[PDB]
Amino acid sequence: PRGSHMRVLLLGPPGAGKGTQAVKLAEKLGIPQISTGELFRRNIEEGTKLGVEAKRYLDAGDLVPSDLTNELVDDRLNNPDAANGFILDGYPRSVEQAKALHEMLERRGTDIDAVLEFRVSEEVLLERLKGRGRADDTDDVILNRMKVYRDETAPLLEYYRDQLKTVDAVGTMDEVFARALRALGK
Ligand SMILES: Nc1ncnc2c1ncn2[C@@H]1O[C@H](COP(=O)(O)OP(=O)(O)O)[C@@H](O)[C@H]1O
Ligand SMILES: Nc1ncnc2c1ncn2[C@@H]1O[C@H](COP(=O)(O)OP(=O)(O)O)[C@@H](O)[C@H]1O
Ligand SMILES: [Mg+2]
């Protein structure tokens, strides 16, 4: 047994349960969870200049351009709360963001420890998103987000192939939590 100070990526399509498990893992491991969707939504609700520009992209299910997202994650990781590890939820979502992340962490003398892919069939995703009812959880937006995932984000499974663990993310919250912990060796 080696300690809990880890840097974990959760990768997976919209609805895979990433936000859900990131909160549970953050509590268990004693490290913050960081959601790029959450940070954009806060910017939007405080009406920042970033919020104003990001909203067109969030509303449509598109990714916010990478220059804005990379800068935002770089800034968040400057918080001393993230100094002994973190769980990232929804970033990186493209190979460009993965290379940008590598640079950010290298500057700070560290790197990613583990990468968990939340594997969930599309039928399950749809039922979950329809039950969630967030603003972007509509049929046309969900379709776009799925294409976004396939086109931009799914290539990360190959990029992180050496660190990747796939989790059967269909089951109870407790079931999936235990599976994610086994994947982390915890
Ligand atoms: N194991 C699970 N079983 C059933 N529903 C779940 C499970 N995990 C999460 N959910 C629910 O499904 C929806 C999507 O979960 P969420 O964690 O927001 O996914 P993501 O962050 O991957 O888009 C939420 O309404 C959430 O409460
Ligand atoms: N890494 C990212 N790069 C670009 N845009 C992002 C990123 N993360 C989140 N966003 C924007 O925020 C939206 C909501 O993200 P998220 O909360 O992660 O959705 P979900 O919880 O369903 O996985 C995304 O559809 C996108 O418009
Ligand atoms: Mg989420």
* Best mutation site among 40, 59, 152 for ligand 2 pocket (most ligand atoms within 8 Å of CB): 40
Cα(160)–Cα(162) distance, integer angstroms: 6
Q: Quick one: CA torsion of 111, 82, 109, 87, rounded to 10 degrees?
A: 0
In the sheet where 164-168 sits, what is the strand order?
A: 33-35, 86-89, 7-11, 114-119, 164-168
Identify the burial level of 79 via C-beta atoms within 10 angstroms of its C-beta, where 0-12 means exposed, 13-18 middle and 19 or more buried.
exposed
CA angle 106, 74, 22 (to 5 degrees): 95
Half-sphere exposure in the Cβ direction for 14 (13 Å, CA)? 28
Structure tokens that stand for 32 in this block: 């913050």
Task: Write the CB contacts of 60 (distance below 8 Å, at least 6 apart in sequence).
Answer: 141, 144
SS (HEC) of the chain: CCCCCCEEEEECCCCCCHHHHHHHHHHHHCCCEEEHHHHHHHHHHCCCHHHHHHHHHHHHCCCCCHHHHHHHHHHHCCCHHHCCCEEEECCCCCHHHHHHHHHHHHHCCCCCCEEEEEECCHHHHHHHHHHHCCCCCCHHHHHHHHHHHHHHHCCHHHHCCCCEEEEECCCCHHHHHHHHHHHCCC
Q: Which of 175, 165, 169, 155 is nearest to 8 (CA)?
A: 165
- Going from the Cα of 90 to the center of ligand 2, the distance in angstroms, rounded, reads 6
Identify the burial level of 8 via C-beta atoms within 10 angstroms of its C-beta, where 0-12 means exposed, 13-18 middle and 19 or more buried.
buried
Cα(172)–Cα(164) distance, integer angstroms: 22
Q: Quick one: CA torsion of 87, 60, 173, 32, rounded to 10 degrees?
A: 20
Cα(185)–Cα(177) distance, integer angstroms: 12
Structure tokens that stand for 156 in this block: 């990360």
CB 92 within 8 A of CB 100: yes
Q: Which of 31, 44, 39, 35 is nearest to 14 (CA)?
A: 35
CB 152 within 8 A of CB 93: yes
What CATH code is carried by the domain that includes residue 62? 3.40.50.300
The resolution in angstroms reads 1.9
Q: Which of 62, 85, 53, 127 is nearest to 72 (CA)?
A: 53
Query: Residue whose CA is closest, atom 16 of ligand 2?
Result: 37
Q: Quick one: CA torsion of 87, 91, 97, 102, rounded to 10 degrees?
A: 0
What is the domain count for the chain?
1
Pocket of ligand 2 (CB under 6 A): 14-15, 18-19, 35-37, 40, 57-58, 61-64, 69, 90-91, 93, 97, 145
CB 68 within 8 A of CB 53: yes
Q: Domain range for residue 161?
A: 1-186
